[PDB]
Amino acid sequence: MLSQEFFNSFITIYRPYLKLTEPILEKHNIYYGQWLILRDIAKHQPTTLIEISHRRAIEKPTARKTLKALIENDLITVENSLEDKRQKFLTLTPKGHELYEIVCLDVQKLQQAVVAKTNISQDQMQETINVMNQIHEILLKEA
């Protein structure tokens, strides 16, 4: 039908997009995996973990196995206490939003050079974010 040429036209771009975003994270010895939490963390901090499981929302296993690397690494920061520790202001670390800048900026340099080669007036760009944002409503009122 139609709908099919539709969802997979936008899905068959995920790994064709990271596959080239691999070098910029190779410039930084980092997992895209982490970055996401770090882009999830940079945007939402003081945010803590009870909320993290909420937005990207994937099982505990992967979630903390990645806050495994972030914590020792001069990366993400937690609060200090006796207090159970999901809720210890899981803020970001100093260097961390300095690691934020270059990844986020170099990734931006690529996407931009890609939009560059497209006759996509921002008019068709926004004509899209509300479709793509219109689909998060369900994967958001679905799981």
JSON list of C-alpha atoms in Angstrom, two decimals:
[
{"chain": "A", "resi": 1, "resn": "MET", "atom": "CA", "xyz": [0.00, 0.00, 0.00]},
{"chain": "A", "resi": 2, "resn": "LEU", "atom": "CA", "xyz": [1.30, 3.45, 0.76]},
{"chain": "A", "resi": 3, "resn": "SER", "atom": "CA", "xyz": [2.00, 3.52, 4.51]},
{"chain": "A", "resi": 4, "resn": "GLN", "atom": "CA", "xyz": [4.70, 0.93, 4.06]},
{"chain": "A", "resi": 5, "resn": "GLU", "atom": "CA", "xyz": [6.81, 2.86, 1.54]},
{"chain": "A", "resi": 6, "resn": "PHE", "atom": "CA", "xyz": [6.37, 5.42, 4.31]},
{"chain": "A", "resi": 7, "resn": "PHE", "atom": "CA", "xyz": [7.63, 4.22, 7.73]},
{"chain": "A", "resi": 8, "resn": "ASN", "atom": "CA", "xyz": [10.62, 2.41, 6.27]},
{"chain": "A", "resi": 9, "resn": "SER", "atom": "CA", "xyz": [11.66, 5.37, 4.14]},
{"chain": "A", "resi": 10, "resn": "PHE", "atom": "CA", "xyz": [12.35, 7.15, 7.43]},
{"chain": "A", "resi": 11, "resn": "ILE", "atom": "CA", "xyz": [13.66, 4.02, 9.24]},
{"chain": "A", "resi": 12, "resn": "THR", "atom": "CA", "xyz": [16.17, 3.00, 6.60]},
{"chain": "A", "resi": 13, "resn": "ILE", "atom": "CA", "xyz": [18.10, 6.07, 7.55]},
{"chain": "A", "resi": 14, "resn": "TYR", "atom": "CA", "xyz": [19.04, 5.31, 11.16]},
{"chain": "A", "resi": 15, "resn": "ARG", "atom": "CA", "xyz": [22.03, 3.15, 10.65]},
{"chain": "A", "resi": 16, "resn": "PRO", "atom": "CA", "xyz": [22.90, 4.80, 7.30]},
{"chain": "A", "resi": 17, "resn": "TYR", "atom": "CA", "xyz": [23.25, 7.98, 9.49]},
{"chain": "A", "resi": 18, "resn": "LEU", "atom": "CA", "xyz": [25.26, 6.61, 12.47]},
{"chain": "A", "resi": 19, "resn": "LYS", "atom": "CA", "xyz": [27.52, 4.58, 10.12]},
{"chain": "A", "resi": 20, "resn": "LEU", "atom": "CA", "xyz": [29.08, 7.92, 9.16]},
{"chain": "A", "resi": 21, "resn": "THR", "atom": "CA", "xyz": [28.66, 9.56, 12.49]},
{"chain": "A", "resi": 22, "resn": "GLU", "atom": "CA", "xyz": [31.09, 6.71, 13.66]},
{"chain": "A", "resi": 23, "resn": "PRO", "atom": "CA", "xyz": [34.24, 8.68, 12.79]},
{"chain": "A", "resi": 24, "resn": "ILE", "atom": "CA", "xyz": [33.27, 11.74, 14.82]},
{"chain": "A", "resi": 25, "resn": "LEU", "atom": "CA", "xyz": [32.85, 9.55, 17.84]},
{"chain": "A", "resi": 26, "resn": "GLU", "atom": "CA", "xyz": [36.07, 7.79, 16.95]},
{"chain": "A", "resi": 27, "resn": "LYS", "atom": "CA", "xyz": [37.68, 11.28, 17.14]},
{"chain": "A", "resi": 28, "resn": "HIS", "atom": "CA", "xyz": [36.41, 11.07, 20.79]},
{"chain": "A", "resi": 29, "resn": "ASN", "atom": "CA", "xyz": [36.86, 7.38, 21.93]},
{"chain": "A", "resi": 30, "resn": "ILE", "atom": "CA", "xyz": [33.17, 7.17, 22.58]},
{"chain": "A", "resi": 31, "resn": "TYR", "atom": "CA", "xyz": [30.05, 5.09, 22.03]},
{"chain": "A", "resi": 32, "resn": "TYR", "atom": "CA", "xyz": [27.19, 6.72, 20.24]},
{"chain": "A", "resi": 33, "resn": "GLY", "atom": "CA", "xyz": [25.32, 4.83, 23.01]},
{"chain": "A", "resi": 34, "resn": "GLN", "atom": "CA", "xyz": [26.82, 7.03, 25.67]},
{"chain": "A", "resi": 35, "resn": "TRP", "atom": "CA", "xyz": [26.48, 10.29, 23.73]},
{"chain": "A", "resi": 36, "resn": "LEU", "atom": "CA", "xyz": [22.68, 9.70, 23.59]},
{"chain": "A", "resi": 37, "resn": "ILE", "atom": "CA", "xyz": [22.51, 9.43, 27.36]},
{"chain": "A", "resi": 38, "resn": "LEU", "atom": "CA", "xyz": [24.91, 12.39, 27.44]},
{"chain": "A", "resi": 39, "resn": "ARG", "atom": "CA", "xyz": [22.64, 14.36, 25.03]},
{"chain": "A", "resi": 40, "resn": "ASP", "atom": "CA", "xyz": [19.74, 13.02, 27.16]},
{"chain": "A", "resi": 41, "resn": "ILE", "atom": "CA", "xyz": [21.79, 14.04, 30.24]},
{"chain": "A", "resi": 42, "resn": "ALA", "atom": "CA", "xyz": [23.07, 17.39, 29.02]},
{"chain": "A", "resi": 43, "resn": "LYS", "atom": "CA", "xyz": [19.61, 18.57, 28.06]},
{"chain": "A", "resi": 44, "resn": "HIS", "atom": "CA", "xyz": [17.89, 17.29, 31.23]},
{"chain": "A", "resi": 45, "resn": "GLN", "atom": "CA", "xyz": [20.42, 17.65, 34.15]},
{"chain": "A", "resi": 46, "resn": "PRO", "atom": "CA", "xyz": [19.98, 17.82, 37.38]},
{"chain": "A", "resi": 47, "resn": "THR", "atom": "CA", "xyz": [17.81, 14.99, 35.96]},
{"chain": "A", "resi": 48, "resn": "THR", "atom": "CA", "xyz": [18.48, 11.61, 37.58]},
{"chain": "A", "resi": 49, "resn": "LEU", "atom": "CA", "xyz": [17.92, 7.98, 36.53]},
{"chain": "A", "resi": 50, "resn": "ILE", "atom": "CA", "xyz": [14.34, 7.41, 37.45]},
{"chain": "A", "resi": 51, "resn": "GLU", "atom": "CA", "xyz": [13.62, 9.94, 34.71]},
{"chain": "A", "resi": 52, "resn": "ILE", "atom": "CA", "xyz": [16.20, 8.53, 32.18]},
{"chain": "A", "resi": 53, "resn": "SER", "atom": "CA", "xyz": [14.39, 5.23, 31.92]},
{"chain": "A", "resi": 54, "resn": "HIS", "atom": "CA", "xyz": [11.46, 7.40, 31.00]},
{"chain": "A", "resi": 55, "resn": "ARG", "atom": "CA", "xyz": [12.53, 9.13, 27.76]},
{"chain": "A", "resi": 56, "resn": "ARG", "atom": "CA", "xyz": [14.84, 6.85, 25.84]},
{"chain": "A", "resi": 57, "resn": "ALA", "atom": "CA", "xyz": [13.38, 4.34, 28.09]},
{"chain": "A", "resi": 58, "resn": "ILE", "atom": "CA", "xyz": [15.23, 1.04, 27.60]},
{"chain": "A", "resi": 59, "resn": "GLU", "atom": "CA", "xyz": [15.84, -1.64, 30.24]},
{"chain": "A", "resi": 60, "resn": "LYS", "atom": "CA", "xyz": [17.89, -1.24, 33.33]},
{"chain": "A", "resi": 61, "resn": "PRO", "atom": "CA", "xyz": [20.72, -3.52, 31.98]},
{"chain": "A", "resi": 62, "resn": "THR", "atom": "CA", "xyz": [21.87, -1.36, 29.15]},
{"chain": "A", "resi": 63, "resn": "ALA", "atom": "CA", "xyz": [21.03, 1.89, 31.08]},
{"chain": "A", "resi": 64, "resn": "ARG", "atom": "CA", "xyz": [23.50, 1.36, 33.92]},
{"chain": "A", "resi": 65, "resn": "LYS", "atom": "CA", "xyz": [26.08, -0.65, 32.00]},
{"chain": "A", "resi": 66, "resn": "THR", "atom": "CA", "xyz": [26.53, 2.74, 30.16]},
{"chain": "A", "resi": 67, "resn": "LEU", "atom": "CA", "xyz": [26.50, 4.82, 33.34]},
{"chain": "A", "resi": 68, "resn": "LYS", "atom": "CA", "xyz": [29.27, 2.30, 34.14]},
{"chain": "A", "resi": 69, "resn": "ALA", "atom": "CA", "xyz": [31.64, 3.99, 31.72]},
{"chain": "A", "resi": 70, "resn": "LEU", "atom": "CA", "xyz": [30.28, 7.58, 32.34]},
{"chain": "A", "resi": 71, "resn": "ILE", "atom": "CA", "xyz": [30.99, 7.64, 35.99]},
{"chain": "A", "resi": 72, "resn": "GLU", "atom": "CA", "xyz": [34.73, 6.66, 36.22]},
{"chain": "A", "resi": 73, "resn": "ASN", "atom": "CA", "xyz": [35.60, 8.58, 33.08]},
{"chain": "A", "resi": 74, "resn": "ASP", "atom": "CA", "xyz": [35.81, 12.28, 34.12]},
{"chain": "A", "resi": 75, "resn": "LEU", "atom": "CA", "xyz": [32.35, 12.10, 32.67]},
{"chain": "A", "resi": 76, "resn": "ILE", "atom": "CA", "xyz": [28.89, 12.25, 34.28]},
{"chain": "A", "resi": 77, "resn": "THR", "atom": "CA", "xyz": [28.54, 13.11, 37.88]},
{"chain": "A", "resi": 78, "resn": "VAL", "atom": "CA", "xyz": [26.44, 11.84, 40.76]},
{"chain": "A", "resi": 79, "resn": "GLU", "atom": "CA", "xyz": [25.73, 13.26, 44.18]},
{"chain": "A", "resi": 80, "resn": "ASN", "atom": "CA", "xyz": [27.35, 11.99, 47.37]},
{"chain": "A", "resi": 81, "resn": "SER", "atom": "CA", "xyz": [25.34, 10.22, 50.13]},
{"chain": "A", "resi": 82, "resn": "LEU", "atom": "CA", "xyz": [24.07, 7.07, 51.91]},
{"chain": "A", "resi": 83, "resn": "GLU", "atom": "CA", "xyz": [20.83, 7.72, 50.13]},
{"chain": "A", "resi": 84, "resn": "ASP", "atom": "CA", "xyz": [19.94, 5.03, 47.66]},
{"chain": "A", "resi": 85, "resn": "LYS", "atom": "CA", "xyz": [21.60, 6.37, 44.49]},
{"chain": "A", "resi": 86, "resn": "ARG", "atom": "CA", "xyz": [19.38, 6.50, 41.46]},
{"chain": "A", "resi": 87, "resn": "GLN", "atom": "CA", "xyz": [18.21, 9.84, 42.88]},
{"chain": "A", "resi": 88, "resn": "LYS", "atom": "CA", "xyz": [21.61, 11.43, 43.72]},
{"chain": "A", "resi": 89, "resn": "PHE", "atom": "CA", "xyz": [21.37, 14.43, 41.43]},
{"chain": "A", "resi": 90, "resn": "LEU", "atom": "CA", "xyz": [22.72, 12.59, 38.35]},
{"chain": "A", "resi": 91, "resn": "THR", "atom": "CA", "xyz": [23.98, 15.91, 36.97]},
{"chain": "A", "resi": 92, "resn": "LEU", "atom": "CA", "xyz": [26.63, 16.11, 34.32]},
{"chain": "A", "resi": 93, "resn": "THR", "atom": "CA", "xyz": [30.34, 16.57, 35.03]},
{"chain": "A", "resi": 94, "resn": "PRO", "atom": "CA", "xyz": [32.51, 19.55, 34.11]},
{"chain": "A", "resi": 95, "resn": "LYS", "atom": "CA", "xyz": [34.52, 18.21, 31.12]},
{"chain": "A", "resi": 96, "resn": "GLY", "atom": "CA", "xyz": [31.39, 16.33, 30.08]},
{"chain": "A", "resi": 97, "resn": "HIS", "atom": "CA", "xyz": [29.55, 19.20, 28.55]},
{"chain": "A", "resi": 98, "resn": "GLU", "atom": "CA", "xyz": [32.96, 20.25, 27.14]},
{"chain": "A", "resi": 99, "resn": "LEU", "atom": "CA", "xyz": [32.88, 16.70, 25.59]},
{"chain": "A", "resi": 100, "resn": "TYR", "atom": "CA", "xyz": [29.31, 17.77, 24.78]},
{"chain": "A", "resi": 101, "resn": "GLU", "atom": "CA", "xyz": [30.35, 20.67, 22.53]},
{"chain": "A", "resi": 102, "resn": "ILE", "atom": "CA", "xyz": [32.68, 18.95, 20.00]},
{"chain": "A", "resi": 103, "resn": "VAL", "atom": "CA", "xyz": [30.63, 15.83, 19.45]},
{"chain": "A", "resi": 104, "resn": "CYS", "atom": "CA", "xyz": [27.43, 17.90, 19.12]},
{"chain": "A", "resi": 105, "resn": "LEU", "atom": "CA", "xyz": [29.19, 20.49, 16.93]},
{"chain": "A", "resi": 106, "resn": "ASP", "atom": "CA", "xyz": [31.06, 18.04, 14.64]},
{"chain": "A", "resi": 107, "resn": "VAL", "atom": "CA", "xyz": [27.85, 15.91, 14.23]},
{"chain": "A", "resi": 108, "resn": "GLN", "atom": "CA", "xyz": [26.16, 19.23, 13.31]},
{"chain": "A", "resi": 109, "resn": "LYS", "atom": "CA", "xyz": [28.87, 19.87, 10.68]},
{"chain": "A", "resi": 110, "resn": "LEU", "atom": "CA", "xyz": [27.93, 16.61, 8.95]},
{"chain": "A", "resi": 111, "resn": "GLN", "atom": "CA", "xyz": [24.20, 16.78, 9.00]},
{"chain": "A", "resi": 112, "resn": "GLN", "atom": "CA", "xyz": [24.50, 20.34, 7.74]},
{"chain": "A", "resi": 113, "resn": "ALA", "atom": "CA", "xyz": [26.78, 19.31, 4.84]},
{"chain": "A", "resi": 114, "resn": "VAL", "atom": "CA", "xyz": [24.07, 16.67, 4.05]},
{"chain": "A", "resi": 115, "resn": "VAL", "atom": "CA", "xyz": [21.16, 19.02, 4.21]},
{"chain": "A", "resi": 116, "resn": "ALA", "atom": "CA", "xyz": [23.61, 21.06, 2.12]},
{"chain": "A", "resi": 117, "resn": "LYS", "atom": "CA", "xyz": [23.33, 18.67, -0.77]},
{"chain": "A", "resi": 118, "resn": "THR", "atom": "CA", "xyz": [19.57, 18.65, -0.69]},
{"chain": "A", "resi": 119, "resn": "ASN", "atom": "CA", "xyz": [16.98, 20.95, -2.14]},
{"chain": "A", "resi": 120, "resn": "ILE", "atom": "CA", "xyz": [15.28, 20.84, 1.20]},
{"chain": "A", "resi": 121, "resn": "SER", "atom": "CA", "xyz": [14.24, 24.37, 2.11]},
{"chain": "A", "resi": 122, "resn": "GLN", "atom": "CA", "xyz": [13.77, 24.51, 5.85]},
{"chain": "A", "resi": 123, "resn": "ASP", "atom": "CA", "xyz": [10.12, 24.70, 4.70]},
{"chain": "A", "resi": 124, "resn": "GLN", "atom": "CA", "xyz": [10.28, 20.99, 3.98]},
{"chain": "A", "resi": 125, "resn": "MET", "atom": "CA", "xyz": [12.45, 20.50, 7.14]},
{"chain": "A", "resi": 126, "resn": "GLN", "atom": "CA", "xyz": [9.80, 21.75, 9.61]},
{"chain": "A", "resi": 127, "resn": "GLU", "atom": "CA", "xyz": [7.10, 20.13, 7.32]},
{"chain": "A", "resi": 128, "resn": "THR", "atom": "CA", "xyz": [8.79, 17.01, 8.79]},
{"chain": "A", "resi": 129, "resn": "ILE", "atom": "CA", "xyz": [9.61, 17.56, 12.46]},
{"chain": "A", "resi": 130, "resn": "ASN", "atom": "CA", "xyz": [5.92, 17.73, 13.21]},
{"chain": "A", "resi": 131, "resn": "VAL", "atom": "CA", "xyz": [5.36, 14.42, 11.44]},
{"chain": "A", "resi": 132, "resn": "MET", "atom": "CA", "xyz": [8.36, 12.84, 13.27]},
{"chain": "A", "resi": 133, "resn": "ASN", "atom": "CA", "xyz": [7.37, 14.53, 16.51]},
{"chain": "A", "resi": 134, "resn": "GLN", "atom": "CA", "xyz": [3.79, 13.45, 15.72]},
{"chain": "A", "resi": 135, "resn": "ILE", "atom": "CA", "xyz": [5.05, 9.83, 15.81]},
{"chain": "A", "resi": 136, "resn": "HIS", "atom": "CA", "xyz": [6.87, 10.06, 19.16]},
{"chain": "A", "resi": 137, "resn": "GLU", "atom": "CA", "xyz": [3.41, 10.75, 20.73]},
{"chain": "A", "resi": 138, "resn": "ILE", "atom": "CA", "xyz": [2.61, 7.05, 20.19]},
{"chain": "A", "resi": 139, "resn": "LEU", "atom": "CA", "xyz": [5.86, 5.37, 20.90]},
{"chain": "A", "resi": 140, "resn": "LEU", "atom": "CA", "xyz": [5.28, 7.67, 23.89]},
{"chain": "A", "resi": 141, "resn": "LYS", "atom": "CA", "xyz": [1.82, 6.67, 24.68]},
{"chain": "A", "resi": 142, "resn": "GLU", "atom": "CA", "xyz": [2.53, 3.14, 23.59]},
{"chain": "A", "resi": 143, "resn": "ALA", "atom": "CA", "xyz": [5.24, 1.54, 25.66]}
]
